[PDB]
Scaffold this active site. Structure first.
Site: not given
Lengths: 678, 63, 63, 63
Positions: A255, A294
Site C-alpha cells: 500500500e 494516506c
C-alpha cells in the site's frame, strides 16, 4: 534510552548504527533505535513453533473473545498512549482517531468474528456443491490457517491503527505476527505491544516486534508466511522483488502513496448547502494530522465557473486554522513528525511549483525552526490536462492543488488521471451524476464517498477507513486490499476445494450436509441440550395428507386468495394446471409436524434462511419432514447471570409421497446449554 | 390449530410467563402468512410464482 | 386441527391405506361431539348439567 | 361452531351469568377432545384402536 524489540519472548535491543527519534515540537532526540545483531531467524522460528500452533488450537470464537479482551485491556490504558502520541506532533483529535480507531478495529473484528465465524478451527465458506447424479460425489471449499508468520511493515502515519488494523485479521485467521513499525514513531508501537504482552491475554509467541531494521528476516521466510508493506513506493517495490519472496511465492501486499481527489458536481451552486459542506470537507481532510494520512485530499477538481469562488472560500476557511503547539490552547493543527518529513514536503511543493503551479496560500515553511511545522498550502493548476506532474507528485503534508474542469466529463477524466487512488469524494445532489461518476471512476478508486446534505450529518469522512470497508486501490495506490471485514481474515488462510462423498464432507466440515449419513435417537432432537446435540442428529416426522379443506382454511386465515389456490378456472391455464397448496402452508405445516410442544432446551426460532419451493403440492398429496441438526455455534456468556445458549442451524427437508423434495430450507434457533463459561 | 404448532410460547400461558417475552406471542410463520395476505394481489396478472423467500429474521415479538 | 389429535388413521392416507379400515375415518370424539350438537337444545330450560358419559363404545367406523 | 352445540352455558353471557357457574364455561366434550390432542401419539405405532371410554365425570368447570 534505547527502544527495545520483543522477539523470541525477550525484550532486547541492538548495537551499532542507530537512528534517533526526535520530538516533533521541541526537536530533541528522546529515543534512539537499533536492532543490529538480533537473531531474526530465531524470532521467526519462535513465532512459528509455539505461537502458531497455540493460535491454531483455538476456535474462531475463542480468537474473537481474545480480540475483545485485548481491546478492553488496551482501552483502559489509553492515557499512556495519548501521552506518547503527544511526542509525535498530534493534537488530541488526531491521537483520538489513531488510538480509538485502532481499538475500535479490534472491537469490530471481535464482533464480526463471534457473529459470523464457525465454532471450529476450520472454516467452510460456501454450501455443498453437488457434482453428480446420484449424489455420491460433491465438494465444498474450506479455509484453514497458514502455518507461517505474518510480517507487517507499517508506516509512521498511524502507529497504533496501522498495527491493529492488520493484527486483528491476522490473529482471527490464526497466524502469529511480527511487526516492524516505521523508525520515526516506533516508540508508540512499542508501548501498545508491551500492553498486549503484559496483559497475559494472548498466547506466547503470538506477537513479536522489531524496532529498527528487519535485517535478513525476509531471506528466512518460506511459502507459508505473508508480508504486508505500507509506505513509499520505492521501498515497497524493492521489497516486492526480494529474491526469497519471489522464489517461494510468498504473498506480498503493498500500500503506497495515492493522489486522492475530491470532485464538485456540475449541479452544485454556491447558494446550496453542498457548497459549504464541500469546503468544510476539503479543509478538514487537508488539515487533520497536518494532512499526514494516506487518504488526505491532494487534488481538488471543480467546474471552471466555480473556481474563483471555491478558491476564495478555501483560503478563507484555511486562514483561520492556527498552527502551533497543541499543548497551547488555541492550536487546531500541529506539526509534522520530522524535520526530514518537512524537508520532503517542501521539496515536493517546490517540484509542483517548478512544474507550473501557482500558490494561493503559503507554500514556504521554516526550514530551520525547531518544530516541524508546515503552513496549510493551497496550490493552483491552470492547465490540468497538460501538466502531468500534478497527477503524479504527492506532497505528504497539508498541501493540495485546486484545478478546473469542464463539461462534467473532463472532471471524470481528471479524477481517473491519478493512476489509481485509495479514496475519492464527489459532492453532488443529483443521483444520476453520482451514478455516472461511479460507473466511470470506481475502477481507479478503492473507496468513493458520495457527499450530499443527507449523508453529511453522520458521515465518517473522506479520510477515515472503516473496518467493514476495503482499504486499498489499484496502480499508484499499491494494488493491495485491507480491512474488508472477513476478506482481510481470508488473506491469512488457504482456500482448498475438498471433493468426496457427502458423509466424508460432513465429517471434514463438522457440519451436516445434504446427502450425508444421519443418526436417529428415538429422543426428539428438541429435547436435547446444546452439548448433547451432534450435527446429523435427525428426526423423521409423521405424515400429513393435504386436502382441499387445507387450501381453503389457510387462504381464509392468512388472507391470501391468489388465483393459483382459489380460482379453478384461472388455475386451469396456469403452468401447474390446477389449484395447489400455498407455499407458506407447507412451511407452517412442516413446523407443525416437527416442533416439540413442551418446555425444553429450544428457546427461540427467529430465523429461516434459504427457502425454495421446488415442486407444487396438490390436494391428495401427503407430506413428511426430516429435521436434521446441521450446524452448531456456541455463544459466549457476556456476563455472569445471562443464561448460556448456542445457535443451532437445522436443515429441513419436506418430501411428498414419491419421496420427491417439495421444499428445502434451514431454520436458526437458540438452544440452552447445560454448562456456562462465565 | 391449522398448522399443528402448539409450542408453549404461543399456547401455554403458565410457561410463557417465565419466558423472555413474558406472555404468549403470535407465531412467526403467522406474521409471514398474514403479511403475504396483506400484500398479495389476488387476480390474474403478470406475477406468475413466488417460489422463494430469502432472508427472514424475526426481530421483535408480536402480541 | 381444533382438538390437536393428528392420529394417522385420520390424517395420513398412506398409513391409513394399510390400516384395518383401509382409508381415513372420522374421529370418534367428533362423532360424540356432533351427536351432542344434533340433540342438545340451546335455550334455557329444565336441563341444568351434563357432567357425565357412562359407557361409550365405537362400533363401526364413520367415513 | 364445529360441533353445533350452542348450549346457553357456553354461548349466552346473560343466561350464563344466572347459572350456577356464574359465567360461560368450556364444553366438557372439548376438554375431552383437547386432552386426547395433548396425549395421543400421531405416528404409526403399536396402538391400533381406541374404540372405548369408560367412566367420564366432569368435576370442575373450565373457564
Amino acid at each position: 534510552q534505547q527502544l527495545a524489540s520483543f522477539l523470541s519472548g525477550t525484550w532486547q535491543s541492538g548495537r551499532g548504527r542507530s537512528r534517533l527519534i526526535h520530538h516533533a515540537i521541541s526537536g530533541e532526540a528522546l529515543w534512539e533505535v537499533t536492532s543490529e545483531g538480533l537473531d531474526m531467524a530465531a524470532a521467526r522460528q519462535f513465532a512459528i513453533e509455539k505461537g502458531a500452533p497455540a493460535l491454531r488450537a483455538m476456535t474462531f470464537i475463542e480468537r474473537a473473545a481474545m480480540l475483545k479482551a485485548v481491546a478492553k485491556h488496551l482501552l483502559s490504558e489509553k492515557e499512556r498512549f495519548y501521552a506518547l502520541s503527544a511526542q509525535t506532533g498530534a493534537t488530541r483529535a488526531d491521537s483520538w482517531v489513531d488510538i480509538e480507531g485502532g481499538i475500535g478495529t479490534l472491537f469490530t473484528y471481535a464482533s464480526l468474528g463471534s457473529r459470523e465465524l464457525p465454532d471450529d478451527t476450520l472454516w467452510p465458506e460456501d454450501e455443498l456443491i453437488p457434482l453428480s447424479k446420484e449424489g455420491g460425489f460433491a465438494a465444498r471449499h474450506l479455509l484453514t490457517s497458514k502455518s507461517g508468520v505474518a510480517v507487517h511493515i507499517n508506516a509512521f502515519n498511524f502507529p497504533c491503527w496501522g498495527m491493529l488494523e492488520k493484527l486483528a485479521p491476522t490473529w482471527l485467521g490464526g497466524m502469529p505476527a511480527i511487526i516492524k513499525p516505521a523508525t520515526a514513531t516506533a516508540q508508540l508501537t512499542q508501548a501498545m505491544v508491551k500492553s498486549i504482552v503484559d496483559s497475559g491475554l494472548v498466547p506466547e509467541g503470538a506477537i513479536s516486534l522489531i524496532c529498527g531494521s528487519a535485517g535478513d528476516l525476509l531471506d528466512h521466510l518460506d511459502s507459508q508466511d505473508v508480508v504486508t508493506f505500507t509506505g513509499s513506493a520505492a521501498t515497497g517495490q524493492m521489497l516486492r522483488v526480494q529474491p526469497n519472496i519471489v522464489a517461494k511465492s510468498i504473498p506480498f501486499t503493498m500500500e503506497a502513496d495515492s493522489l486522492n481527489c475530491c470532485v464538485l458536481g456540475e449541479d452544485v451552486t454556491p447558494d446550496q448547502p453542498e457548497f459549504a459542506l464541500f469546503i468544510r470537507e476539503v479543509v478538514r481532510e487537508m488539515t487533520t494530522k497536518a494532512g499526514q494520512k494516506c487518504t488526505a485530499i491532494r487534488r481538488i477538481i471543480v467546474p471552471q465557473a466555480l473556481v474563483n469562488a471555491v478558491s476564495d472560500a478555501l483560503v478563507a476557511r484555511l486562514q483561520k486554522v492556527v498552527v502551533g503547539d497543541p499543548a497551547q490552547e488555541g492550536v487546531k493543527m500541529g506539526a509534522l513528525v520530522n524535520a526530514e518529513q518537512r524537508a520532503d514536503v517542501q521539496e515536493k511543493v517546490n517540484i509542483l511549483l517548478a512544474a507550473g503551479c501557482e500558490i494561493r496560500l503559503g507554500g514556504q515553511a521554516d526550514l530551520s525552526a525547531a518544530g516541524a511545522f508546515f503552513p496549510p498550502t493551497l496550490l493552483y493548476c491552470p492547465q490540468p490536462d497538460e501538466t502531468p506532474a500534478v497527477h503524479a507528485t504527492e506532497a505528504f503534508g497539508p498541501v493540495a492543488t485546486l484545478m478546473p474542469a469542464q463539461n462534467q466529463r473532463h472532471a471524470l477524466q481528471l479524477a481517473c488521471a491519478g493512476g489509481g487512488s485509495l479514496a475519492g469524494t464527489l459532492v453532488t445532489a443529483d443521483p444520476q451524476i453520482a451514478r455516472q461518476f461511479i460507473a466511470d471512476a470506481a475502477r481507479t478508486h478503492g473507496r468513493i464517498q458520495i457527499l450530499n446534505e443527507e449523508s453529511a450529518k453522520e458521515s465518517t469522512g473522506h479520510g477515515s477507513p472503516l473496518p467493514q470497508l476495503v482499504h486499498g486501490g489499484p496502480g499508484r495506490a499499491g494494488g493491495g486490499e485491507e480491512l474488508g471485514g472477513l476478506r482481510a481474515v481470508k488473506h491469512y488462510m488457504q482456500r482448498t476445494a475438498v471433493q468426496g462423498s457427502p458423509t466424508m464432507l460432513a465429517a471434514i466440515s463438522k457440519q451436516w450436509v445434504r446427502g450425508a449419513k444421519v443418526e436417529e435417537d428415538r429422543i426428539h432432537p428438541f429435547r436435547k441440550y446444546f452439548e448433547e446435540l451432534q450435527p446429523g442428529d435427525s428426526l423423521l416426522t409423521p405424515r400429513r395428507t393435504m386436502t382441499e379443506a387445507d387450501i381453503v382454511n389457510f387462504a381464509c386465515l392468512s388472507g391470501d386468495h391468489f388465483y393459483a389456490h382459489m380460482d379453478k378456472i384461472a388455475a386451469a391455464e396456469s403452468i401447474f394446471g390446477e389449484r395447489v397448496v400455498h407455499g407458506y402452508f407447507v412451511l407452517s405445516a412442516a413446523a407443525g409436524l416437527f416442533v416439540d410442544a413442551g418446555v425444553g432446551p429450544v428457546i427461540a426460532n427467529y430465523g429461516l434462511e434459504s427457502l425454495r419451493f421446488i415442486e407444487p403440492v396438490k390436494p391428495g398429496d401427503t407430506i413428511q419432514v426430516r429435521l436434521t441438526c446441521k450446524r452448531k455455534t456456541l455463544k459466549k456468556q457476556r456476563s455472569a447471570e445471562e443464561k448460556p445458549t448456542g445457535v443451532v442451524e437445522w436443515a429441513v427437508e419436506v418430501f411428498n409421497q414419491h419421496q420427491t423434495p417439495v421444499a428445502l430450507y434451514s431454520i436458526l434457533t437458540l438452544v440452552a446449554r447445560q454448562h456456562g463459561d462465565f
